Structures are given as C-alpha cells and as structure tokens.
Amino acid sequence: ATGPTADPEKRKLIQQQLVLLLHAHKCQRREQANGEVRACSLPHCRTMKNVLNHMTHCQAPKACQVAHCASSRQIISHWKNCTRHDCPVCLPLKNASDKR
C-alpha cells in the first residue's frame, strides 16, 4: 500500500525505485551532455530511464495504473512533497548527495 507498509520487499523495491528514478534523471542529463558516447552500465538504469521518459509522455501518471509507471509517479510524488531531513529513503539519498 501507499501507507506505512512494513513488508521488506516493499522497503527495498520502493527505495530502489526512487533512487533509480533520480539516477535516471541524473544519467539522462549526463548522457545528453555528451550525446556521442555512453556513461553508464547499471542493468536497471536503462529500464528506469525508459519509465521516466514514459512518465514525461504520460497524462495520468498515478491513474496510469501500469505497475512501473504508477509506482514511479507515486515515489516521485512522495519525493516532491517530502520534508526530507528525516525520512527513511530521503535521509539515505541526502547522504548519497552530500557532494557533486
């Protein structure tokens, strides 16, 4: 559920979806900044980049009930609404972005 779900697979999958969505945005700009040679090899990154491009073409986002897209928009909507200084996935990402 979108609620305080405690199921461990939900924990890892939801946090990985959000982290790879942000990686897909990052890595799309990074790739576009070169436009002639690749800069990534993470197996799931290309799938999430495709899901992100779909969310850009999409018109329902959340009601676009397809597992990957509906999930993608629910996690990124959480990240958009977030108060991030003390959240279970927010705090990790904040440490994962301490420098650039």
Among 15, 44, 45, 71, binds Zn ion (CB under 5 A): 45
Of 19 and 40, the one with the shorter C-beta distance to Zn ion is 40
Q: Is residue 21 near Zn ion by the rule CB under 5 A?
A: no
Q: Which residues contact 76 (CB under 8 A, 6 or more apart)?
A: 18, 21, 55
DSSP string for 17-82: HHHHHHHHHHHHHHHHTTSSS-----TTHHHHHHHHHHHHH-SSTTSS--HHHHHHHHHHHHHHH-
Least separation in angstroms between residue 86's CB and Zn ion is: 8
Q: Is residue 64 near Zn ion by the rule CB under 5 A?
A: yes
Among 48, 69, 75, 76, binds Zn ion (CB under 5 A): 69
- Which residues of this chain interact with Zn ion, rule CB under 5 A? 27, 40, 45, 58, 64, 69, 82, 87, 90
